[model samples]
Target: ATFEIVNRCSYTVWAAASKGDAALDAGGRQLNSGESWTINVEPGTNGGKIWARTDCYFDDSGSGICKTGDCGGLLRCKRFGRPPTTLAEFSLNQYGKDYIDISNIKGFNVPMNFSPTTRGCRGVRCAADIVGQCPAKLKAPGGGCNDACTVFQTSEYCCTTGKCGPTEYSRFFKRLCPDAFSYVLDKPTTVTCPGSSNYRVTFCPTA
Candidate 1:
């Protein structure tokens, strides 16, 4: 079980991931244009997510801040990334298969590609230009589009209680990346595959 993170963007991006109780890849690392990094995932690891941080400025001590997707100002993230981030979520060796998805339910900051390297598994991605097309109401000053839940914080947008469906805001994202999870009730985005397969996560995938 591993994640091969590839950077296809023109600039550098700080990649963040949960490292269980400790940290991942010594917390987090920088990936420059065309570069790649690999991190091993322990078996039975479920509900893990990976995302990219942009416009960051850190020191030798590894203490800095990110304009988007900052995790409590720590380089080695011990928790989930902040909002307005594109996410690749996974659950490995649970029940019988590996489940994965590309989520914009938290809103998108960058385009991403998530695919299994093993045969017999399908690929899923959110490669749309979401940031450039982000709506004014849900726009984040730093970058990326904010999820309705974050902006409105209403039951309608958050879907906190009973069954909830897509709204106009979520439809906006779904229209762009139909394969991604644009809202809390998004089930179509989830993909299942055999366990123990290596996966690839690419940032800024081309059309």
Candidate 2:
């Protein structure tokens, strides 16, 4: 499967992808507005995620920090990024189907849209403007809204144990982005598609 990363924001965005031990192509790179990068993912790839980093500064050695979605301050991320960012999660060729979704369970820093390049596959997106109207308690000091789990860190909010469900905090995010995973217990956020389909992910998609 080929994943295309498109930058529609006014400023440049540093895109990142992590697929465990799978070799990534341009996994960490700067993408200017109107530009894009395509990554060819191997078959049977599962539990991989893609995200964007904003307000970043890197030196020659690729050591820097980003205001949002920083992955251990490394240019080539070998692990998952930090919270307060949007994510495109995928599981390809798994259990005879391809699973995909836009997740905000860790909170959202930017709007994102993920869609299949071809027909027959349904697209899922969370393109709401979250930064401008983030809830006070959940709002990050740097920017974006922090997930309820990150803020409260309770069993109910994190769903650490027992049969858990959404809280008023999770509902706040769901109200804005119905298609995203606002919390761990968020249901129906994932969509199943056929394998080997190309996907296009755009940041700050036009309204």
Candidate 3:
């Protein structure tokens, strides 16, 4: 599958994508407004994720920290970044089905629209202004909205141990973005599409 990620934010964002868990094999490029990057995801590329890192400054050597999603302070992220982050996740060619989902289960940073380019496959999007409307306790200092689970790692918000229910905090995010994966067990919201379909991801969508 091919993913063409476009950036429409006023500022720059470092797009991060590692196909193999922590492989850091692709992406990790600086995308200014109106710029886009295309990546081809091959078969068996399970657990692949694409996220944006906001408010970052890197030297020529490709090492820096992003205010919202800093993966060990590296411009070329080798692992998962810190939340509040918006993730576009993918599992390609699994039993002849390609699964895709837009997730804020960790938290939320920027707005996003992840959709299929080839027709007939449904997609998911979350473009709410959760950062500006974040509750006091759930607000991250760096401008993102930290989820209740990230702020308070209890079973109620996290569903960390086993079966769990939603709280006021999770509800806050859910109310704004019903389609996103807000909580651990709320719903997978994963879309199963054909293996041949490619996708397009836009950050800070205008529409």
All-Cα superposition RMSD per candidate = 1.5, 1.5, 1.5
- TM-scores, one per candidate: 0.95, 0.94, 0.94
For residues 1-207, could you state the per-residue lDDT of candidate 3 as single tens digits? 778989998888888887635643565888999999997777767888889999998888888788987887778777888898998888888888888998888889999999999876898989989888889998899879998888888877878687887778878888989988888888678898988689998999862
User: Per-residue lDDT of 1-207 in model 2, one digit per residue for the tens?
Assistant: 899999999988888888755435656788888889998877678888888888889999989998888888977777777889888999888867788999888889888999989656799888888877789998998778888888888998888985689898889889999999988878877988887777998998973
Per-residue accuracy of model 1 over 52-116 as CA lDDT, tens digit each: 89988888888889988888888878777788999988888988789989989888988899999
Segments in model 3 whose C-alpha atoms lie over 4 Å from true places:
none
Question: In candidate 1, residue 25 scores what lDDT?
Answer: 52
Is 1 or 3 the stronger prediction by TM-score?
Answer: 1
